């Protein structure tokens, strides 16, 4: 839960999961970029954020 993560300030679990490439779902109202470029997908930029 992104709201809980913002409130606690404790980023240990999220940091450990991101460092170790552990599949996860971040839940919360998020702004998103609409990318229409195939090259952006081939560059795998959605994984860089």
């Amino acid at each position: 839960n992104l709201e809980e993560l913002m409130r606690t300030g404790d980023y240990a679990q999220i940091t450990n999961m991101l460092l170790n490439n552990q599949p996860v779902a971040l839940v919360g109202a998020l702004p998103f970029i609409t990318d229409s470029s195939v090259i952006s997908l081939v560059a795998k930029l959605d994984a860089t954020v």
Binding site: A12, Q13, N16, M17, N20, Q22
Partner: protein, 396 residues
């Protein structure tokens, strides 16, 4: 093992300490340990079972960390924690059961189940913390080749053996001289019987000797000695050595004479007790030598004088008893005893899931066969399963 023990101890501490209303300062270190366990376990897949009727179970960890409060835990916190705790306890029980039902002639001390083998990886060493129980402490010491110690109340050190030796006999079994004994668990009951009451024996003394070779060295042993053997003081009909015939025993009990208990280690006398009854201490031994004597009483009242004629037939056979009871001892190896449940737990788990007989332990985990042939490989496997059984007992 240390890691499995640490998981189990963390879960036990969480169950005991994460209680509604408690100060967060009571649980802070425990919460940190628990969250570290969650971090280390999350994302790892485990498989338990697939032996006998133990079902195959798959374990996945995708849990959140336990939160923090200002002052005291509330009911919400406890329920949230208890969900995670319950899943972890299920997992640990299943891992322990998977390890308890497996054995190996080679490397019987090493983990045998897949989940414990995975738990021995470096990544899980973070979980490891206070290893304070007797079994885990001895496990760590034995890994380091340091002197181990297990304290047993009434150790099951003697395999069951109800036998007799005849030193003087003949096909009619009417003038018999010999010894009969029960070695069972932590008790020795021996009795030397002379049918002639040592009428012809030199000095009117018949010497009886019994030797029990303990399969492991006992130390710091409290032993009760009692003059009589209540098990061999009533009349009985006993099979012949080859079973061909039965003979008759009609004990009349006399005080054992020149009682001498020797506790020996590697063939050397360590402790000696002459005509001492009650509590004695055997500090370090692997052999018990009980020497006693039937001394014909030089004076007899007419009732007594009648029972022991100069010659056959002998109807009242003079028996001298001896009872030895190891109340508590210390052994460098693991043993069954009257106060623990490790053997019973392992046997229960093996019987409940119909574990087929393996190449290490006797069928049914029968203690008599196991202790009779207590090989080092058996000792390693049995220490492993006993440690796992204790780890399981922390939670189940």
């Amino acid at each position: 093992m240390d890691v499995l023990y640490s998981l189990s101890k963390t879960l036990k501490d969480a169950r005991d300490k994460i209680v509604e209303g408690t100060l967060y300062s009571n649980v802070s270190d425990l919460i940190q340990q628990f969250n570290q366990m969650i971090i280390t376990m999350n994302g790892n897949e485990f498989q338990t079972g697939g032996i006998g009727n133990l079902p195959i179970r798959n374990w996945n960890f995708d849990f959140g960390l336990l939160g923090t409060t200002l002052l005291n835990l509330d009911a919400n916190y406890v329920e949230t924690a208890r969900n995670t705790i319950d899943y972890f306890v299920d997992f640990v029980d299943n891992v322990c059961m998977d390890e308890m039902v497996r054995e190996s002639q080679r490397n019987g001390i090493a983990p045998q189940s897949d989940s414990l083998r995975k738990l021995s990886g470096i990544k899980f060493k973070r979980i490891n913390f206070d290893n304070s129980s007797e079994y885990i402490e001895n496990w760590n010491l034995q890994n380091r080749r340091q002197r181990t110690g297990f304290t047993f109340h009434k150790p099951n050190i003697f395999p069951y053996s109800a036998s007799f030796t005849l030193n003087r006999s003949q096909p009619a079994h009417d003038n018999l001289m010999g010894t009969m004994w029960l070695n069972a668990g932590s008790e020795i009951q021996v009795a030397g019987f002379d049918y002639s009451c040592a009428i012809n024996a030199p000095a009117n003394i018949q010497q009886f000797e019994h030797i029990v070779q303990l399969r492991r060295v006992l130390t710091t042993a409290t032993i009760t000695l009692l003059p009589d053997a209540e098990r061999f003081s009533f009349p009985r009909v006993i099979n012949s050595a080859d079973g061909a015939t039965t003979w008759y025993f009609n004990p009349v009990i006399l005080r054992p004479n020149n009682v001498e208990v020797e506790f020996l280690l590697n063939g050397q006398i360590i402790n000696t007790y002459q005509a001492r009854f009650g509590t004695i201490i055997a500090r370090n031994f692997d052999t018990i030598r009980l020497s006693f004597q039937l001394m014909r009483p030089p004076n007899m009242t007419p009732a007594v004088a009648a029972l022991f004629p100069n010659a056959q037939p002998f109807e009242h056979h003079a028996t001298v008893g001896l009872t030895l009871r190891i109340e508590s001892a210390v052994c460098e190896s693991v043993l069954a005893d009257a106060s623990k449940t490790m053997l019973a737990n392992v046997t229960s788990v093996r019987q409940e899931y119909a574990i087929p007989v393996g190449p290490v332990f006797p069928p049914g985990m029968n203690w008599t066969d196991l202790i009779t042939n207590y090989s080092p490989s058996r000792e390693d496997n049995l220490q492993r399963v006993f440690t796992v059984a204790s780890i399981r007992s922390m939670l189940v």
